[PDB]
Each structure stands twice: as C-alpha cells, then as structure tokens.
From a paper:
Eukaryotic ribosome assembly involves the coordinated activity of more than 200 assembly factors that assist in the formation of small and large ribosomal subunits. Here, we report the cryo-electron microscopy structure of the yeast co-transcriptional large ribosomal subunit assembly intermediate that serves as a checkpoint. The structure provides the mechanistic basis for how quality-control pathways are established through co-transcriptional ribosome assembly factors, that structurally interrogate, remodel and, together with ribosomal proteins, cooperatively stabilize correctly folded pre-ribosomal RNA.
By using the pre-rRNA mimic with MS2 RNA aptamers and tagged [name] as baits for affinity purification, we were able to isolate an early co-transcriptional assembly intermediate (hereafter referred to as the [name]–[name] [name]). The resulting composite cryo-EM reconstruction contains domains I and II of the 25S rRNA, the 5.8S rRNA and ITS2. The most prominent feature of this particle is the [name]–[name] complex, which is responsible for remodeling all root helices formed by the 5.8S rRNA and domains I and II of the 25S rRNA (helices 2, 25 and 26). The [name]–[name] complex not only binds to several critical root helices, but specifically encircles helix 2 through molecular shape complementarity in a non-sequence-specific manner. Helix 2 is a crucial root helix of the forming LSU: it contains the 5′ end of the LSU pre-rRNA, and initiates the formation of the polypeptide exit tunnel, one of the essential functional centers of the LSU, which is formed in a tightly controlled manner during subsequent assembly stages in the nucleolus. Further, we observed an unprocessed 5′ end of the LSU pre-rRNA that extends beyond the B1S cleavage site, which later generates the mature 5′ end of the 5.8S rRNA. In conjunction with assembly factors Mak16 and Rrp1, [name]–[name] pre-assembles the highly intertwined rRNA domains I and II, thereby positioning these domains for co-operative stabilization by ribosomal proteins. Key links between domains I and II, such as helix 19, are prevented from establishing contacts, and [name] substantially overlaps with domain VI, thereby preventing its incorporation during early co-transcriptional stages of LSU assembly. In accordance with this data, the structure of the [name]–[name] [name] indicates that the assembly of this particle likely serves as a checkpoint because the [name]–[name] dimer interrogates the formation of root helices that form the core of the nascent LSU, encapsulates helix 2 and stabilizes the 5′ end of the 5.8S rRNA. Thus, by various modes of action, including steric hindrance and pre-rRNA remodeling, [name]–[name] serves as a central nexus that stabilizes a co-transcriptional pre-rRNA folding intermediate while delaying subsequent post-transcriptional maturation events until transcription of the entire LSU pre-rRNA is completed.
Author numbering:
A (entry chain K): 31 to 51, 71 to 303
B (entry chain o): 88 to 220
C (entry chain G): 87 to 239
D (entry chain t): 54 to 105, 127 to 214, 227 to 322
E (entry chain s): 239 to 310, 331 to 395
Amino acid sequence: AIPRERVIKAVNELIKFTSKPEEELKKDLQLIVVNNKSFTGTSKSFKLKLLNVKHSFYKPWKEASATAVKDFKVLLILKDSDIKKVSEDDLFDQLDSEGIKVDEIICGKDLKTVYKAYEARNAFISQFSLILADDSIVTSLPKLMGGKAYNKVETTPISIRTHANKEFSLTTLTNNIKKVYMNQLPVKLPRGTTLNVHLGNLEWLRPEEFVDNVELISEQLIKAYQIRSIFIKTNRSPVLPLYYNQDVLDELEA
Amino acid sequence: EYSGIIYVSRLPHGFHEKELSKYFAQFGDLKEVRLARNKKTGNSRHYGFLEFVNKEDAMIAQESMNNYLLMGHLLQVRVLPKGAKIEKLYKYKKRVLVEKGITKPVKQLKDNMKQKHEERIKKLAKSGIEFKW
Amino acid sequence: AAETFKLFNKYRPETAAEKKERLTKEAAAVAEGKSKQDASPKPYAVKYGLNHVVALIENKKAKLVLIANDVDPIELVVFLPALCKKMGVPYAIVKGKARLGTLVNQKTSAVAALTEVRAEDEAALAKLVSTIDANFADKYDEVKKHWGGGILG
Amino acid sequence: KFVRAESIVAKTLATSREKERIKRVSILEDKKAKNETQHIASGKDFILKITEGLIREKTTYDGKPALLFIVRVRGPLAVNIPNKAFKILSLLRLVETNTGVFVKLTKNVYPLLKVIAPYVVIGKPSLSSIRSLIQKRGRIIVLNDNNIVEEQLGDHGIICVEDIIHEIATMGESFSVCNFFLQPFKLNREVSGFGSLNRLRKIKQREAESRTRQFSNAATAPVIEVDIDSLLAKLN
Amino acid sequence: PYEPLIDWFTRHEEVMPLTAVPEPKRRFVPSKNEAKRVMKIVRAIREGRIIPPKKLKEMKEKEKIENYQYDLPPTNEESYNPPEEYLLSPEEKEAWENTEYSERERNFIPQKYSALRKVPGYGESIRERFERSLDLY
RNA sequence: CCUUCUCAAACAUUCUGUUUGGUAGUGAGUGAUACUCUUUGGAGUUAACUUGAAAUUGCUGGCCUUUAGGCGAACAAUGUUCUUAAA
C-alpha cells in the first residue's frame, strides 16, 4: 500500500503552496502523474477507464461552477430509438431523487447534421464537461466528435450502458448514470510511460478526502498496472514523490 | 510581370497532388505540382503549388479558379511574380512509432531512480516545504 | 448557382397538397375522443413574394435574396440590387425566373428571399454568403459600373 | 471531357472509407482465424434477418454447410471497387451487375461475406425459387462446351436438369460440379428505367433499399439476410 | 456624350433599417387561421361529412377486393412420340430449309422425337403465337 | 457532394444486478507543471486555452515485404477496373 500520512502531508503542504499570493483558477487543481512501463496498449486508447472513487468531486464541481463563469453541463448521447422512447422528464424525476441533472440528450444524427461544422461543433462541446454516450455509439464517435474533443479529458466521452437485457430498461440507465457520476472518475489512456489523472481544485474537497481518493486510485492502478512511481502535484507547482516500485524498472528493460 | 508558378490555398480534405495534376494538366501540360505537407501524420495543410509549361496557360487557369466554390468552400489561386521559384517541399508520410532497446543494464538505472527519487526529494526541501520521504 | 439550389431544395415550401394532407391528418388527430394535443416548432422555408421579399428587406431579415434576370417588367426589379447593396443584404442575381418558380411550387417567382435557417445549414449559409460576396460583389462591381451593350447586331 | 472537381472528392473519401472498413475486417478475421482473441469486438459472428419500421431478428452463426444464393446490388453511390473485393467478386463472377449465383456457406467461405457485404445481399432461398430461377433463367458456355461438360456431368451421374435442382438443394454429392456448370447467371433490372412512370419506381425502390440494406462498417457486422422469395418474385 | 456613373451615395452604408415597425404578435405564436381551418375540418368530421384518411384507406382496401370479386386437329399428322412418319423429316430437310420462311415454320414444326428425356425447348412456339396474334389483328 | 463501428459475452434472477472486451484525430497556434527512457538524435506522454473546416514552403525517421503496402494484423498485406445517377 501507500503511507497515507505522506499523502496527507503532501496535500496540506500543497495547500500551503497555493496559499502563497484562467491560470489563477488553474494553479489550485490536483493532477496525479503515474510513471509505468509500456503504458501503451501498443496502440491509441481513447477509452476512459472508470476507477472506483470514495468521494464525488462532481457535486463540489456543481457548487463551485454555479459561482464560476463556466457552468457545469451534462451531455448524453443516445440512439435515435432511445431518444424516441426516452423523455427528459422521465430522466429528471429520477435525478432529482439524488439531486443531479442532465443538461441535454443528443443523437448521432443530430451530431452529424446539426454540428457538422467545426466552429459550431467545437463551441457545442466546449460548453460541456461530462460527455456520456451509449457504449454502442461510443465505438462510432471519433470522426464525429472531432479530435479537439478527444484532446481534453472533459470533452472526450465516457462509456455508459443503457442495455442490461436484449432491450434497454430505464432502470439500467438511471443507476448507470449514478455509477458513472458519483462513483467513477475518468482516466485517459495515452501512449508512452506517463499517465495523468484529474482530481480538481483543492478548494472543493477535504484534503483528507483528497488523500483517501488519491490512495484508493493509486492502489487500484497498482493492482491494474505495474507502476514505476506515483508523482502527484498541481499543474503549476513542482513535483512530489509519494510512492514508487523500483523492480518495475527492471521489468521495463527485460 | 508574373511567372508560371502558382499558389493555391484552401484545398479540400483528401485532395492530393495526384488529383491536382489530373485537372491542371487538362488546362495544359504542367512542369511541376506539389502540396504543402505535415511531418508526424498524413493530414492536409490545404495549400499547394503548381507550375505550368506556359505562363499564358497559367494565367487562364488562375483566372477561372481564383474564387472556385468547391466541396462546400471556396478556393483561391494566385500567380507568382516573375521572380519566384519552387523550394523545399516533399510528400511526407505518416511517421509511425519506434521501440528502441534500453541500453543500460538493469542495475544501473536501478541506481539512477534511487538517485532521482532522492534527488526529487531534494528539490522539495529546496522548493520547498517540510518533507520526510 | 448549383449549390445555391441544392441549399434551397432542402427549404422547399410546403405544397398546397402537402399542407392539406397535414391539415386533414391533424384534424383527424383532433377527431379522437381521446384526441391528442401537442405544440410544434416553427416551419422553415424560403420566401418568394415580391412585396413580401422587399418587406423582409428594410428589417432586415433576408440572409439571402436571389433575383431573376428575365422579368418582362424589369422595373419591378431594378431597385433590388441597389437596395440590398446599400442595406448590405447578400443579394445575388440568379438567371431564370422559371427555375425559382420550380423550387417554390410556382410557375415563376422572379425573387427568392430566405431569412430563417436551421442550425444544420447555418454554417453552409454563412460560407455561401462569403462565396457570393467573393464571386459577385468583387468580380462584377467595376463592370456593374459601366455602360453595357451599344454594339450593333 | 472536363470531368469535375467534386466527384473526385466523393470517390476518394469513399475509398478511404472502404479501405478502412476492409482493413478492420482483415484484422478481425485474421485474429479470429489464428485464435488470438485478446482485444477485439466479439468472439463469434452474427446473422441479421429483415422481415415484415420492419422487424429485424439476429442469430448466431452455425458452422453448418448452408445453401445460399448471392444477388449483387448496385454498389454505393461514389466508390471505385478496391482490388480485394474485385478479386473476390471475379472469383464469384459477380461482375456485370444484376448477377447472382448459388454458394455453399461454411466457415472458410464466411469471412469473405463481410468483404463483399456492401456490394451484395444474402438470404435463404426455397426450392420453388430455385426451380423458377433455373427453369426460367440460366445459360451455359457457348457451343461444344455446353455439350461436353454434360458428358462429364453424366460421369458424375446427373441427368434431367431437375436433378440439378435436387442436388443443389441437397448438396449430398457434388455442388461445386453443378456450381461450375451454372457459371453465368443473369437477372433483369426490376425497373425499365427511363420514363415518366418508371422514375417514380426508381425513386421508390431507392428509398426501400435504403431502408433495407445496412452498411455497418464495423467488422462485426451481422450478415444481412433478406427473404429471397420476395426478391426473386420481383426480379423473376 | 457618355460618361460612367458616379457611385457617390451608394458607398455610404446605413447601419439601421428605414422603418421602426413594431413586431406583431402573430409572428411568434402558432397561427390562428390554420387552427380555425383545423376546427372547421373537425366539426365536419364530427358530423361525418369527411371520412378520416385511415378509414378511407380501409374502405379502399376492402373495395378493391370487393370490386374484383363480384361478376356475372393436325397433331396426329404430327408425330411427337417415337412414331415413324417423321422419318420423312430428315430426308428432305435440306429441301424444306430451301423454302421461304413462311413455308419454313410450318415445315420445321416436324422434327424427330427421340424419347421422353429430351425436349428441344420451343424455339418456334413464341414466334408462331406472335404471328397468330398478328393474324387476328 | 459520400456519409461516419450506432454491441459481445460470462455469471446471476434483483421486475436488471455484477464483471470483462470493443473507439486512430481537423489543420493551425499559445502554453504550465513536468514524467520516463533514449544516449543525445531526441522519442512517447501531461494542464488547458484560441479558432468562420482558418491556411504559405517546419527539408530525406527505422524495420519488413513486393514492384505500392504492415508495424492498431507476418508466410501479414495493396492499384482507381460496378453502368437503365444515360444521352
């Protein structure tokens, strides 16, 4: 495992670094970096791995984005048939039970005709943060979203499932949106030895809660991949050791 | 006065020199054709250069093409002055990855990381806020 | 002109026949006991009546106007180019009133104005506007600016 | 002729499309044949069946030698054929459109179906359809060729062409024999084409086909199948 | 003489429209007159003067069926089954070939019947029926 | 003037739940913190911002095969050749 005291120490002292008087918003945001051997799948991997996390920073994202200029907005991407059967109120009544909200639902037809225009498409995606798409549609997205959508973490889509049986039930979508929203966080899978994972502004969560999220994510990743080390920081601050496995280097050579 | 060398901007997606040659030959035999090209991945910079055998034919092609609506956007072609020459273009391909062997044996970079981690601990006392590990 | 007409053919106006089919459909929909009541969005179509076309000018609302060249009372149309020039509407002189009639469920129209366009064509509309500004306003303004004809036949 | 600057863009992008999809199919079928399923879409294949929005039912493929009759449908709007599909079609003699042929369906034949899926249509024929096809259509190589193979066919043991129907339906003894014996096949065009009344039918079957034929471009595309009893009722 | 026309006033561009007409209400609400026409059709169908289009198609589908429902010797001279007479057929075959076509068709009706297995396949029959149709016409 | 992979399995019965796999980009520019290795040649990654599908020359990676193709498939592999969308 990883010594939690070290991570608590790091988060408190990064709070200290930030307390010293877009970039000004930027210099408070938490970024894990993970060095690991041959993180490639030998191939590009736009698929986002959804790691189980104890706490949900999207609700703090709501509470701070209400004040922020950019408003948090949710995009769901469903088939023509699903949008035909699914209505906005049916989703809204389910989401007010836990107190969240989808901002819009969109079709692939809609993407390929309404937003087949680079400026309009870019503005439409950049407005939003959470991009959800049916796992069936997810395999067809890349030529539609545009590469600029896939460069950034928020703009790239998240895999979500509507079907559980042969046909899809609203219960599956209802609880899968909850699973993706308040129990899962995105993880891009680029090439090279370097991974980056987003947590968010320090001001949103408890630093001890930050630590619990960081350690849960790190041990999940260690169980997943052979990690050279775990380098957490803020994207303005210098770099910080917490943990490292040295034998991974030997395996990297061999 | 102008030359036979020609500049065309705003080229469609997928519209390569093989397509350019097959039309601008129809106006007349051309000495040269090139398109401006990116290195890492085979995608367009949407502009290219032509060169015709006869300047007068080059004038005609420019005249009928200066505002050529095509594939949902307009093309703009302009004749070069007499003092103009073709330079430094090449058909770049998609540059694929490499995996080169790690030269130092295991136990050497074993030492480097312990140095680097311990070193990467030291900038933190230098940055720097009280750290043990 | 070809792409202008391809753009317009998506925005054909509803025929009298199609209008009556939808009317009887919805009236039958009201027929049921157990009827159905719904609210529907705005229609989208070109606009074509001469005084109506000038009406959408002086607002302004015409994002595009096409003017046929062959009109036996040409004085019906001589002002439209200068009017849209001074107003900045992106006018274009199309050639043939009959073809305007074809795209509008009429014999002839002599004018074709469009104001409201869906998001799925808005970028196409803007780029075509820049195109016509490049092909017509730039090319022919200096030869709009001379006396024509005068050569014997 | 001055051809155009526009159709070239359509055919170039459509070739990039056909090339990427056939490449994906080659990856998937090579990995499946070599039994190296580590990171792929699906491990087994599927067959789609459209019948009378219209009901579309899907099944898992059976490694069973099944009789089919291929019908070649006009290719996509602006595509020049890639050479791989060209070779497959030439082997199956599906050039000269409105051309079909009977085929055995086994696992070795099966991967090529995705290769030529955007240029053909599949389905399950009935003996009534097959009988109408042969007794109303079918010719054999010119002059003595037609006679001499009938002798070789007799050496195999076939006579009275109705027995060719029986063996094509049965597949008991030798299908490739009869398959090579029926080397050319031809069907009329369902619409006479040019004319005031006819153009309506052209547009209507264009819409109907656009409803029916589906271009997955997934490489896990379920095999689209149609009721050939209706297709030949139209085309024969 | 002639001179080009000066464009001294067109070059000035007004940034506003000529007239400040207040926008009417009806441009933003669904049109009332189509609703009135709809309700006219509604009262008509309620009285039954107009049949619904679905019921009309049902009536047509039934009525098509209902309308289409209610209403109120040379062969032995010819051989055709292992018989002998057609042994005259190959003897003067060149001779009948040498006659005119309008003689040939009747003269090439007769051909040797080998056995049940083979039937040559009716090269002549369609032409004979077409000629008979013309003879009627 | 074309249209974008719009689902697979296994377990389980909870009136649908759990797990696993499936996604090559629109080009150009700004740019933080940096990460590893390469053996100095730099290479693959990293915050996130701009843009009317915008527009000017960033010189020639490497391996393999054949006479262009794979490195996201090795005895792996690809070319532009469908006519009742004509005349």
